[PDB]
Amino acid sequence: MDFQNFVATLESFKDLKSGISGSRIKKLTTYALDHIDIESKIISLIIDYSRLCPDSHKLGSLYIIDSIGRAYLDETRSNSNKPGTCAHAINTLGEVIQELLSDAIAKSNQDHKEKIRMLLDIWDRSGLFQKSYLNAIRSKCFAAAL
């Protein structure tokens, strides 16, 4: 599985009615861990997929970030922040996560909003995006104000 396979596999999430596949996300996640050296273009793509995907697909896009993000966060802990490290990848994601969350929440139905909230809770318990204040974004009032 090469980069072009990664791009095509990411793009195929549009052909999923739900925007979600456990096996396909695992496929992306295994690729991400095998190719940390090119994380910079893996990360930009999954960020952009979040930005651009169908409304109903935004939840899936945060699942993709959850999976790769917490996988990289584990590689970080198994022990620099230059391109081609897990630390940089997580920093890049952290710099756009509030943008991506606010939009995903605003475009999600109640069901998907609630799944984003639980995912926020898992991020909180994990230390994924700990530098970011996510507790206001997490509120039900936030979703309604959008």
UniProtKB/Swiss-Prot annotation:
Location of the CID domain: 2-143
Parts forming coiled coils: none
Protein name per the record: Protein NRD1
Signal sequence, renumbered to the chain: none
Function: Plays a role in sequence-specific regulation of nuclear pre-mRNA abundance.
Entry superkingdom: Eukaryota
Gene from which the chain derives: NRD1
Compartment(s) where it occurs, according to its Swiss-Prot or TrEMBL record: Nucleus
Species classification: Eukaryota, Fungi, Dikarya, Ascomycota, Saccharomycotina
Miscellaneous section: Present with 19600 molecules/cell in log phase SD medium.
